[PDB]
Amino acid sequence: VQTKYLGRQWRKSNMKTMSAIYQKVRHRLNDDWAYGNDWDFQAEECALRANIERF
Amino acid sequence: QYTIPGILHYIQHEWARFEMERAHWEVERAELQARIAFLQG
Amino acid sequence: QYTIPGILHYIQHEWARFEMERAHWEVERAELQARIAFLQGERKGQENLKKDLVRRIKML
Amino acid sequence: QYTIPGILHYIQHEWARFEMERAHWEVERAELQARIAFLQGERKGQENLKKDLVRRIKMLEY
Amino acid sequence: GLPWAPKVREKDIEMFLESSRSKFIGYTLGSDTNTVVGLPRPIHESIKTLKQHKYTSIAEVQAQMEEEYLRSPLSGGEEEVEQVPAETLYQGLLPSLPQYMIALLKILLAAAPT
Amino acid sequence: DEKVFTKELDQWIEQLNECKQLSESQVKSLCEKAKEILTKESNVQEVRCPVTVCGDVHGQFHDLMELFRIGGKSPDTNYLFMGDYVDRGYYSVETVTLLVALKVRYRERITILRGNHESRQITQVYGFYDECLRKYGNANVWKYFTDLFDYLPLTALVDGQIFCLHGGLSPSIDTLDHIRALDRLQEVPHEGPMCDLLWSDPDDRGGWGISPRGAGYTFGQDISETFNHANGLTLVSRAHQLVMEGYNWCHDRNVVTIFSAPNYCYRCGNQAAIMELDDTLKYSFLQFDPAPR
Ligand SMILES: O=P(O)(O)O[C@H]1[C@@H](OP(=O)(O)O)[C@@H](OP(=O)(O)O)[C@@H](OP(=O)(O)O)[C@@H](OP(=O)(O)O)[C@H]1OP(=O)(O)O
Numbered sequence: 221v222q223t224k225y226l227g228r229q230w231r232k233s234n235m236k237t238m239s240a241i242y243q244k245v246r247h248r249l250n251d252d253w254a255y256g257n258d259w260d261f262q263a264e265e266c267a268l269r270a271n272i273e274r275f
Numbered sequence: 276q277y278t279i280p281g282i283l284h285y286i287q288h289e290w291a292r293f294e295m296e297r298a299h300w301e302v303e304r305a306e307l308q309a310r311i312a313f314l315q316g
Numbered sequence: 317q318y319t320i321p322g323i324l325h326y327i328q329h330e331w332a333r334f335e336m337e338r339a340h341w342e343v344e345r346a347e348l349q350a351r352i353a354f355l356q357g358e359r360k361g362q363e364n365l366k367k368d369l370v371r372r373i374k375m376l
Numbered sequence: 377q378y379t380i381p382g383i384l385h386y387i388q389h390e391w392a393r394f395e396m397e398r399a400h401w402e403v404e405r406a407e408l409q410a411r412i413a414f415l416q417g418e419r420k421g422q423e424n425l426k427k428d429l430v431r432r433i434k435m436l437e438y
Numbered sequence: 439g440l441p442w443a444p445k446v447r448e449k450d451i452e453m454f455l456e457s458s459r460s461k462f463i464g465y466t467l468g469s470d471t472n473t474v475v476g477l478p479r480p481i482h483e484s485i486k487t488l489k490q491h492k493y494t495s496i497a498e499v500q501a502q503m504e505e506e507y508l509r510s511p512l513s514g515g516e517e518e519v520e521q522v523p524a525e526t527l528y529q530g531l532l533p534s535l536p537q538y539m540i541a542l543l544k545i546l547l548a549a550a551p552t
Numbered sequence: 553d554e555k556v557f558t559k560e561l562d563q564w565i566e567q568l569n570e571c572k573q574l575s576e577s578q579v580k581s582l583c584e585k586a587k588e589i590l591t592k593e594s595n596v597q598e599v600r601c602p603v604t605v606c607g608d609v610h611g612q613f614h615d616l617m618e619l620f621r622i623g624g625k626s627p628d629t630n631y632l633f634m635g636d637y638v639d640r641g642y643y644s645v646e647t648v649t650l651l652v653a654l655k656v657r658y659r660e661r662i663t664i665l666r667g668n669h670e671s672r673q674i675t676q677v678y679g680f681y682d683e684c685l686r687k688y689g690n691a692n693v694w695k696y697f698t699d700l701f702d703y704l705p706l707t708a709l710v711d712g713q714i715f716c717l718h719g720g721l722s723p724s725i726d727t728l729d730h731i732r733a734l735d736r737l738q739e740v741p742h743e744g745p746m747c748d749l750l751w752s753d754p755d756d757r758g759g760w761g762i763s764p765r766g767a768g769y770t771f772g773q774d775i776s777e778t779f780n781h782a783n784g785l786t787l788v789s790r791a792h793q794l795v796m797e798g799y800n801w802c803h804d805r806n807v808v809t810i811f812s813a814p815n816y817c818y819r820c821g822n823q824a825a826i827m828e829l830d831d832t833l834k835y836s837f838l839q840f841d842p843a844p845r
C-alpha cells in the first residue's frame with residue numbers, strides 16, 4: 221500500500237520484497253504499485269469526523 | 276469542434292442524466308408529501 | 317461545448333454536406349466518364365489518322 | 377421500436393459507411409485525373425507528330 | 439501461488455473510464471460508469487472485464503444508505519437497527535469511547551517490550 | 553464492393569511476394585482496413601486448434617519468404633507472429649506490409665502481436681524510419697504503420713492453454729483477466745504493464761529481477777510456474793531474444809522462446825525456428841537457415 225510513494229529507486233533496490241508482494245497479496249486490476257510515479261491530513265480527517273458524528 | 280464518439284457519448288450521458296434526475300425528484304416528492312401530511316396531522 | 321441544440325445543428329448541416337457532396341461527386345463522375353470517352357475516341361481517331369497517313373506516304 | 381442503443385449504432389455505422397464511400401470515390405477520382413493527364417499527353421504527342429509530318433509534306437510541296 | 443481472485447473497487451472503474459473518456463472523447467464526463475458508447479471496442483472489453491470483477495463491500499452500501507437517510511429523513515427513512523450484541527456493545531461504549539481507546543493504548547505502550 | 557477489394561488485396565499480396573512494395577496511398581488504405589480489423593480484437597486473443605507460431609522477424613523479408621516456404625503458404629497454414637517485425641533489417645517496409653496484407657485478407661488464418669519494436673520511438677531510432685524515408689521520401693508511411701501498431705493485440709491464447717506473447721510477463725499482471733483489462737490503444741509507455749509484457753524475459757534468478765535491457769523485468773522460474781498454474785496455461789511461448797539453437801526451453805518446459813529470424817546476429821549466426829501446434833495441441837519445431845542469396 222505504500223510502495224508507490226517509496227520512489228522508483230526503492231523499488232529498484234528491493235525486489236525480493238516486490239516478488240513477495242506479487243505472490244502473497246491480492247492483486248487489484250489497474251493497480252500501479254509496481255510502477256507508481258509519485259495530501260491534506262487534517263482536512264480529510266475533519267471531513268470524515270463530520271460524517272461520523274452525523275451518523 | 277465536435278466528433279462522432281463525442282456526440283454518441285453525450286446523448287447517452289444526457290439520457291442517463293435525465294433518469295437520475297427523475298429518481299432524485301421522485302425521492303424529493305416523497306419527502307415533501309411526507310412533511311405535508313405530517314403538518315396536516 | 318457540447319449541447320443538444322449544437323448536436324442537432326451539427327447533424328443537420330453535416331447530412332446536408334454529405335448529400336450535396338455526393339451530388340457533386342456524381343456530376344463530376346459522369347463528367348469524367350464522358351471526358352475520357354471523348355478523349356479515347358480522339359486517340360482512336362488519331363490512330364486511324366496516322367494509319368491513313370502512313371498509307372498515303374507509301375502511296376506517294 | 378426506437379431504442380437509443382439502436383440509434384447510436386446506426387449513427388456510428390452510417391458515418392463509417394459514408395467515410396468508406398468517400399475514400400472509394402476519392403480514389404476513383406484520382407485515377408480518373410491520372411487518365412485525363414495521360415490522354416492529354418497522348419493527344420499532344422499525336423498532334424505534334426502530325427504537324428511535323430504535314431510540315432515535311434508542305435516542304436515537299438515547295 | 440496466486441490464491442486471491444482479483445478485485446476492483448468502483449473508484450478504479452470510474453477513474454479508468456474517465457481517463458479513457460478524456461483520451462478518446464476529448465471531454466471527461468464525471469462519476470458515470472455506464473456511458474460507454476464512443477470508446478473503441480478494445481475499451482469496451484476492458485470495461486466489461488473490470489465491471490465483471492467488481493467487488494462492492496458492505497461498507498459502500500452502508501455509507502450509501504447513510505447518506506440516503508440523511509437526504510430524506512422522514513419519508514420513511516426512519517429505520518430500526520438490530521440489537522445484535524455488537525450493536526448493544528457499541529451503544530454502551532459510544533459515550534466515553536475515546537477515553538477507553540486512550541487508556542488501552544497507554545496500557546499497551548506501558549507493556550511494549552521496550 | 554466486397555470481392556473487388558478482395559481481388560485488389562490478392563494482387564497486392566502477389567506483388568509483395570516479389571519484394572515490390574506498394575504506393576503510399578495503397579499503404580494508407582491498407583492501414584485503414586487493418587485498423588478496422590484489429591479494433592475487434594481483445595488484448596488477449598484466442599486462436600483455434602492448429603497453428604504455426606513464429607517469433608522475432610525483424611524485417612528480414614526474404615527470410616520471411618523462406619519461412620512461408622518451410623511452413624506452408626498463407627491461407628493453407630494458420631500463423632501467429634509474436635511481434636518485432638520491423639527493424640535491424642533492410643526490407644522492414646516489405647515485411648510489415650506483407651504481414652498486414654495477410655492479416656487483412658485472411659483475418660482468421662493469421663494473427664500478429666505487438667512487439668517491442670512497434671513503438672514510434674524505437675522505430676525512429678533503430679531504422680524503420682530511415683527505410684520508410686528512403687523507400688518513400690516521406691514519413692506518411694511511418695505514420696500510418698505506427699498508428700496501426702498502436703492497435704496490435706498484446707497477447708494470444710491458443711486453445712485456452714498456450715500463452716503466446718512477445719517479450720514476457722510482468723509483476724503488475726497476475727491473470728489474463730488483468731491483461732484483458734488494460735488499455736492497449738496507446739503508444740508503449742515507459743513504465744507500466746505494457747512496457748513489461750513486450751520487454752521482459754525469463755532468466756535464472758528466481759522471482760523478479762532487473763532487466764539488463766533497461767525496461768521490464770526478468771521473471772525467474774517460480775514466477776512462471778505460479779502464473780501458469782493460476783491461469784491454467786500449459787505453456788507460455790515468447791520470442792524476444794536471440795537463441796542460436798532457434799528455440800529454447802526455459803523454466804522447465806514452462807516457457808519457450810522461438811526466434812524466427814535466421815542469421816540475425818552475424819557473430820552468432822543463429823538459425824530460425826517455428827513451432828507447429830497440430831490438431832491435438834502437440835508442438836513440433838522446425839528449424840531453418842537463411843535463404844540462398
Ligand atoms: O483481502 P482484502 O480483499 O483486501 O479484504 C480487505 C481486508 O483485508 P485487510 O484488512 O487485511 O486489508 C479485510 O479482510 P480480512 O483481512 O479482515 O480478512 C476486510 O474484511 P473485514 O472488514 O470484514 O474484516 C475488508 O473486507 P470488506 O471491505 O468487505 O469489509 C477488505 O476488503 P477490501 O479489499 O474491499 O477493502
Ligand SMILES: [Mn+2]
Nearest residue numbers: 608610636792
Ligand atoms: Mn527482436
